[PDB]
Amino acid sequence: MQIFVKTLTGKTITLEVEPSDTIENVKAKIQDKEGIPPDQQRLIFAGKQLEDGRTLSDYNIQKESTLHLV
Ligand SMILES: [Zn+2]
Ligand SMILES: [Zn+2]
């Protein structure tokens, strides 16, 4: 599935991911795109703070969803 991640600058990155992907996995993908270290990445989805060991599906993250780096 496809999701979007908004960096702190409003930049939009596109990610190809799976429902069982962990935030840590996503976090790894963001690092590759922008060079942003995972430990400095904080992801939020629909007002929910996302934990590294949980999956996208665990947060009801669906196709075309948008995540925010904070
Ligand atoms: Zn897909
Ligand atoms: Zn994956």
Author numbering: 1 to 70
Q: What does the publication say?
A:
Here we report on the combined use of MAS NMR, XRD and microsecond-long molecular dynamics (MD) simulations of explicit crystal lattices to characterize the overall rocking motion and the local internal dynamics of the protein ubiquitin in three different crystal forms. We prepared three different crystal forms of the 8-kDa globular protein ubiquitin. These crystals are henceforth referred to as MPD-ub, cubic-PEG-ub and rod-PEG-ub, reflecting the different precipitation agents (methyl-pentanediol (MPD) and polyethylene glycol (PEG), respectively) and the morphology of the crystals. We have shown here that three independent and complementary techniques, NMR, MD and XRD, all provide evidence for an overall rocking motion in protein crystals.
In rod-PEG-ub we find—for several instances of well-isolated regions of the spectrum—three peaks per residue. This peak multiplicity is in good agreement with the number of non-equivalent molecules in the asymmetric unit of the crystals, i.e. one (MPD-ub), two (cubic-PEG-ub) and three (rod-PEG-ub), respectively. Owing to the higher spectral complexity arising from the three non-equivalent molecules, we did not assign the spectra of rod-PEG-ub. The Wilson B-factor in cubic-PEG-ub is almost fourfold higher than in MPD-ub and the resolution is significantly lower, which we propose to arise from differences in the respective rocking dynamics. This correlation between NMR 15N R1ρ relaxation data and XRD resolution is further substantiated by the third crystal form, rod-PEG-ub, which displays lower 15N R1ρ rates, suggesting that rocking motions are of low amplitude (blue bars in Fig. 3b). Clearly, the rocking motion found in the MD simulation of cubic-PEG-ub (order parameters 0.982 and 0.957 for chains A and B, respectively) is much more pronounced than for MPD-ub and rod-PEG-ub (average order parameter 0.995 for both systems). Nevertheless, despite all these shortcomings, our MD simulations clearly reproduce the same trend as has been observed experimentally and thus confirm that MPD-ub and rod-PEG-ub form stable crystal arrangements, whereas cubic-PEG-ub is prone to rocking. A direct influence on rocking of the precipitating agent used for crystallization can be excluded on the basis that both cubic-PEG-ub and rod-PEG-ub crystals crystallize in essentially the same condition (sometimes even in the same crystallization drop). In our case, the packing density is indeed lowest for the crystal with the most pronounced rocking motion, with solvent content Vs of 58% for cubic-PEG-ub, 49% for MPD-ub and 40% for rod-PEG-ub, respectively.
